[PDB]
Each structure stands twice: as structure tokens, then as C-alpha cells.
């Protein structure tokens, strides 16, 4: 209820802020916090180094609500058609982020929650088996953290 939710929201604000401050010093709140931070940083690094290429490919994104799913799925299927690796996984997240930003830009905010759902499903069904065979997210942290 409202009272519980208020209490819980305050706890989560505390945890979020502490996790952030810890990360600025190279520490982590939890393994899960470490994975989130690694992915954020890898996404930044990816988008920064390949700024030209990344801007180019996302500039060719012309989404409508009716074509968003087909656009997402067709790009992700081609991305992983001949393999999964950590860099392609970072590209997958960065692509999803770009789609979400462009959606809001174009007043298609409803797509943000849908894209998040499509991404989580693809991750769980198609990427997780590779991830688990290759040392898990703990290994990603070791490599890209």
C-alpha cells in the first residue's frame, strides 16, 4: 500500500545513492550493482569510441509504433545471426537505448516499456544460454568493468 510503498521507495533511494557513491570509488553495493555499472560504462565506452558509426546507423532509424517491433527484431536477429559475444551484447543494449531515446523524441513514449520487454525476452530466451556457458555476467564484469 501507499505507506509500505513510501517506506520501500525511500529504502531504494538510499540504496541507489549509496551504490552510486561506492561505484565512484571502485567498490560495489552488490554483484548485481557491479553488473549494472559495468554495462552502463561499457555502453558509454561503446557509444563514445564508435560515435560516428553509432550515430550513423541510428540516424537511419525511422520508427513508427506499427513498425517498431519488426525494426527491433530484424536488427537484433541480424546482430546475432552468426554468433553471440560480449561486444555484440553491449551493442544490443546500446541499440535498445537508442530506440528508446528516439521513441521519446518522436512522442512515441509508449514504445519505451515495450522495447524494454522485447529486450528482456530476447536476453532471457536467446542470449542467456551463451552467457551461462561463458562464465555469466560475473565474467562480463571481469572483462568490461
Amino acid at each position: 500500500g501507499p505507506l509500505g510503498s513510501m517506506s520501500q521507495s525511500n529504502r531504494e533511494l538510499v540504496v541507489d545513492f549509496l551504490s552510486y557513491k561506492l561505484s565512484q570509488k571502485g567498490y560495489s553495493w552488490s554483484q548485481m550493482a557491479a553488473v549494472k555499472q559495468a554495462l552502463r560504462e561499457a555502453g558509454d565506452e561503446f557509444e563514445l569510441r564508435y560515435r560516428r558509426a553509432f550515430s550513423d546507423l541510428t540516424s537511419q532509424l525511422h520508427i513508427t509504433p506499427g513498425t517498431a517491433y519488426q525494426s527491433f527484431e530484424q536488427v537484433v536477429n541480424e546482430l546475432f545471426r552468426d554468433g553471440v559475444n560480449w561486444g555484440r551484447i553491449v551493442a544490443f543494449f546500446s541499440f535498445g537505448g537508442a530506440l528508446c531515446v528516439e521513441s521519446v523524441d518522436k512522442e512515441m513514449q509508449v514504445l519505451v516499456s515495450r522495447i524494454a520487454a522485447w529486450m528482456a525476452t530476447y536476453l532471457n530466451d536467446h542470449l542467456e544460454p551463451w552467457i551461462q556457458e561463458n562464465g555469466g555476467w560475473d565474467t562480463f564484469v571481469e572483462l568490461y568493468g
Binding site: 565506452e45 561503446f46 569510441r49 564508435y50 558509426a53 553509432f54 550513423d56 546507423l57 541510428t58 537511419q60 532509424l61 530484424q74 536488427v75 536477429n77 541480424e78 546482430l79 559475444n85 560480449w86 561486444g87 555484440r88 551484447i89 553491449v90 551493442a91 544490443f92 541499440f95 572483462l143 568490461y144
Partner: peptide, 18 residues
């Protein structure tokens, strides 16, 4: 297209760290 370019940079990125 978009997917091919994304793949290329994903691989470049992967080779650097992994």
C-alpha cells in the same frame, strides 16, 4: 545496413576487451 554496422562495431569492441 544498420544491423551490419552495429555488428562490425560490436566485434571491434569485443576484440579490444575480450
Amino acid at each position: 545496413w544498420i544491423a551490419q554496422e552495429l555488428r562490425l562495431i560490436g566485434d571491434l569492441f569485443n576484440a579490444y576487451y575480450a
